[PDB]
Amino acid sequence: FPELYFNVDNGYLEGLVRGLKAGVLSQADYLNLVQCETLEDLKLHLQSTDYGNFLANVSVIDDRLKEKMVVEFRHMRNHAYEPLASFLDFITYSYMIDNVILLITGTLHQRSIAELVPKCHPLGSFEQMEAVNIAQTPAELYNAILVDTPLAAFFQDCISEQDLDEMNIEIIRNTLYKAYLESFYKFCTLLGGTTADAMCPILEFEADRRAFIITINSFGTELSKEDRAKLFPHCGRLYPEGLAQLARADDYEQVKNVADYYPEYKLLFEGAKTLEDRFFEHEVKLNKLAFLNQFHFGVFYAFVKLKEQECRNIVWIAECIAQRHRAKIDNYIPIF
């Protein structure tokens, strides 16, 4: 029933992002880039794929790759009407949150807005809402400027006077990401059908990475067990019970046995490839599974999280080549 529509508005853009899926480097494409020995040979094999002639004009491989996935993402947002344009805006909030914490730091230390253009992610950018460009005021008259930005509703757990050095710089990112993941789950629950069973399993595991990676690095830190409780997103499979036992953990094995209650997250704690290299391969296992379903909006968010894996993998091939340490060159993520 919600499938004989959705091609009225998103018929062309759906076939577009399926066509951009074919430009992802496959397994056979990955093998020939391991056989390279210099960055100039790295330039030659990438001209055989869909990326070609992008280095006509080792850290330039970082920027020229990720600038291609920005303009491909910006071209998709220019044609989505109303059922999808807000959905693509939700993917940019993860990059706007990492941008704004970068901006309140220079605001606190009186480092002006001249550093904003070259040192921010172009996906979540500030080239509209020109009030933020002018603001040099120390983080209290700037929060009144900050609410003219779609991150306003996520600041309802951010008291303005709590911003002035009582909260750590890293803590305010996670409680903003906590406010971000609850809204994007509830927005994807308002949409129903095929975009509610192919997308919400991805958001459950993404909230459960933010369950495990928080508590596994919150051991030597002087943040109490009530702080890491409210930095957990109340979203995934671990919500009523697994979030409770993660607060009392204090030990590496005490976060393992609470992951042993779920057969999905155990057999991923056998990294003993490390843990985040095991969480990444399960994440691209879920984003590949979203490409199965057809008449749904989750094919766009699965494309961006795989396109960031494409820019990640080629650099890791290039860093093993330029530094000439290609005994760990096989430790990439073969997504396709």
């Binding site: 080792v58 850290s59 230390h109 330029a322 530094q323």
Partner: protein, 101 residues
């Protein structure tokens, strides 16, 4: 009585993470990142800025970056602070300050 570092972009983010950086808003920062579009004069004054500071004990600098400011560090012939030449990811340590013998 702290350590200074010039280095590079990828060098200074490792040594700040090591725990050697200090932000003196009164005088100056104790580090200087050099990008592709930093002039040699900016490396030249900051070498003299670190040399004239009393609290600077070591001046870490990549030899790939110290090759253009070689003429200034060859004029520094004092014992303290010690200038050190570290390898980059291109062109590691070959021929700096063992040339006195």
């Amino acid at each position: 009585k702290l350590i200074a570092v010039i280095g590079d972009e990828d060098t200074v983010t490792g040594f700040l993470l090591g725990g050697i950086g200090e932000l003196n808003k009164n005088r100056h920062p104790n580090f200087l990142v050099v990008e592709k579009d930093t002039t040699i004069n900016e490396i030249e004054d900051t070498f003299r800025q670190f040399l004239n500071r009393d609290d600077i004990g070591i001046i870490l600098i990549n030899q790939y970056i110290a090759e253009m400011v070689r003429h200034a560090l060859d004029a520094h012939q004092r014992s303290i602070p010690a200038v050190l030449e570290i390898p980059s990811k291109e062109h590691p340590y070959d021929a700096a300050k063992d040339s006195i013998l």
